[PDB]
Amino acid sequence: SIGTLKRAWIPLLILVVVAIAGFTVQRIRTF
Amino acid sequence: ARPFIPRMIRTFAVPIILGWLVTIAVLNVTVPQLETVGQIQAVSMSPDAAPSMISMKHIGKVFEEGDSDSAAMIVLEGQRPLGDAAHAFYDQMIGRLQADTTHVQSLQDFWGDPLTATGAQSSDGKAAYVQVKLAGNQGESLANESVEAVKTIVERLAPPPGVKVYVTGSAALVADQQQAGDRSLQVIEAVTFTVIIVMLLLVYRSIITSAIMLTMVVLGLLATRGGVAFLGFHRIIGLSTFATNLLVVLAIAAATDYAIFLIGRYQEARGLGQDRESAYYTMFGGTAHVVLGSGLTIAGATFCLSFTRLPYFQTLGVPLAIGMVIVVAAALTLGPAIIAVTSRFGKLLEPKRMARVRGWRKVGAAIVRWPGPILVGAVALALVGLLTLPGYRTNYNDRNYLPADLPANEGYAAAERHFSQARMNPEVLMVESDHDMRNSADFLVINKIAKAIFAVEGISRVQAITRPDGKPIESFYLPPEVFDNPDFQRGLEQFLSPDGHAVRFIISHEGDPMSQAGIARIAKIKTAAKEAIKGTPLEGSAIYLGGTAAMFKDLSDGNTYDLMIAGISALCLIFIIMLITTRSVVAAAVIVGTVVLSLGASFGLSVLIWQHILGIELHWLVLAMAVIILLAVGADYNLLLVARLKEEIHAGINTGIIRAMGGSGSVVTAAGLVFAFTMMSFAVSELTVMAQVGTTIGMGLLFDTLIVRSFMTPSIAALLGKWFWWPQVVRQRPIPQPW
Amino acid sequence: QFLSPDGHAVRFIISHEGDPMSQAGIARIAKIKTAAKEAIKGTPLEGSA
């Protein structure tokens, strides 16, 4: 819901950034 | 009232100081120093599964000449063409070298063979050479003592009159470069010591405060070094010389950063008019979380650096993180403790005069009132920095980055004096087929390969079974009876696998084999060698290419990919920490943009100064070290400044800017200049690569502190306004209070 | 006509295709020089002018 989503936007944003960074680093590493 | 942690730190000050001292003592007396423990367990710098390394191991395995890739050359020249006594002593020496099976694995006797002697002798018949395969890979100590042993065994016996013997190659080069760095250490340390003392007395205008800071820094450095050597001594974690050096540099930088942070905040608080106790409590409550966050961000980034594939960064991940954690722990426990003890006992930490805070408040006033034009000026300077970046070249030859008195350099000089190619850095090509090659048609194909290789733009010699002197430019015929001449059989073992399933040609470049062209040439060598067999029965065989240029091409590719991995990791972690600290999504983005822009401008200025003007090309390691240190220090300073700015927002956006400038700009500037000049004092070293790294970091921090951090980000903050703190809602000015 | 009277030189007379004074014609001469240099490489004429 709105409240439980906007009351914790920081941790979710960090999770998204870490996920993207991990995916990109994994893909680059295999080269 | 008073938080738990500072009260417990200060109440137990003396016992914790004693504990720190005794721990450092025990960790430094019972466990050797970092240089020794690092050298005993050094690791090879070439990746384990690179295309070149596998080729060298396989080539060694097939011909039964060891499993290593270290090699050296012996140069034999005289002022008169060599005679029979030359052969006599050459044979005696070669017997002696073959007697010592401990250190030399296998040998390549060309000059002793009449058929191939032409290919192992100068055009005027005045010089010769030999190849020795040595124990241990590159960079392991085994190679070092093996090359030293060969030097001793060759120099024990006196050469005949008229001739002189050298030792040459890459192994001797690395051994002597290690010795040269060790020699330069003393002078460089003396000069940097005097410069750092001068700078500290200049920043503080006192002798006692400088002495106390030196104490903080040395205790932190000794603790970090002892602890990391303790962990590495028991084979708990890996170590390497590059790791120890960068660890020392980072330890010094972080320790001085935090020491200046704490003492400056203390003195500022005292100047405001608070008593000793409240000054201590406010410095802790204003700097502790910043120090902790910066330390953990740097530790996390330097740990994430460990996923890299190139060992130069792989081995560098754990030890630096452990050292950084130790540094932050020491500077959070021991720091405030001794500050409290020193403040209480007598009268030592005492601010005198006030001339920097007022000046920096004035600079903040200028930034706030006219933020636009100052921004365009700063970005214009960054532009003049950036525009020289795209033209950037790099050189992998390490010969011409050292003084010319190293013995290997005289060996190289002799070789260049009597040879018109780069015959001291050859290569080897291999073809692995599935049938015996000791027959005529396969020889025609072999010669086809040799000729196809010879015709590449850059190659000068291609030494093969067909032509031992290395000029395959002729039509070929060898009747089958030639397999019975014993001399031909000896050459056959030298050049063909004993099973008959492999061939190898020795390829020597022209010019420097390690410049960019010498790196791009091996791909063409492989393509030509592949297309030469196309259509002949040998199709589908496996082609190996082992040599120095191959190794350096692999290293360059790994270098670019690892630089990008580390960049993404570091930048994303900076984003995370700024977001946690400020609770703003635009502020973190602005900081990320500014830091990357500063890296770019700094390196642009450095390349403008070092390659265009002084006419010396940068190394292939400067980028990595420079970016590591610059990113760490920038994270630290930006975190402090932004945290302070957030602290002073409540009374208006912009008077907060000028207050924050007065409070913290001076501290960050002092730390930046001290570290920058401590590094800049390295320009007088005779190991030019260290001069390059030191000067790059120095000029980079000068530009960062004096242009970017003091004029670009405060101006941006004052320009955007309340939109620097989105999504948080803030006000440009408080409610208008009455008179 | 071709060799030098003292016998220390030779000259070749080279004619282009199309328009010698367009961009390609200008670019061709470096290739000519490189080709000659690589042709003399390894032979007793190596390093000549």
Numbering used by the authors:
A (entry chain B): 1 to 31
B (entry chain D): 20 to 493, 688 to 952
C (entry chain E): 707 to 755
From the article:
Structure-guided genetic approaches identify MmpL5 mutations that alter bedaquiline transport; these mutations converge on a region in MmpL5 located in the lower portion of the periplasmic cavity, proximal to the outer leaflet of the inner membrane, suggesting a route for bedaquiline entry into the pump. While currently known clinical resistance to bedaquiline is due to pump upregulation, our findings that several MmpL5 variants increase bedaquiline efflux may presage the emergence of additional modes of clinical resistance.
Bedaquiline, an antitubercular drug that targets ATP-synthase, is a key component of a new oral drug regimen that has revolutionized the treatment of multi drug resistant tuberculosis. Clinical bedaquiline resistance in Mycobacterium tuberculosis has rapidly emerged, primarily due to mutations in the transcriptional repressor, Rv0678 that result in upregulation of the Resistance-Nodulation-Division (RND) efflux pump MmpS5/MmpL5 (MmpS5L5). Here, to understand how MmpS5L5 effluxes bedaquiline, we determined the structure of the MmpS5L5 complex using cryo-electron microscopy, revealing a novel trimeric architecture distinct from the canonical tripartite RND efflux pumps of Gram-negative bacteria. Structure prediction modelling in conjunction with functional genetic analysis indicates that it uses a periplasmic coiled-coil tube to transport molecules across the cell wall.
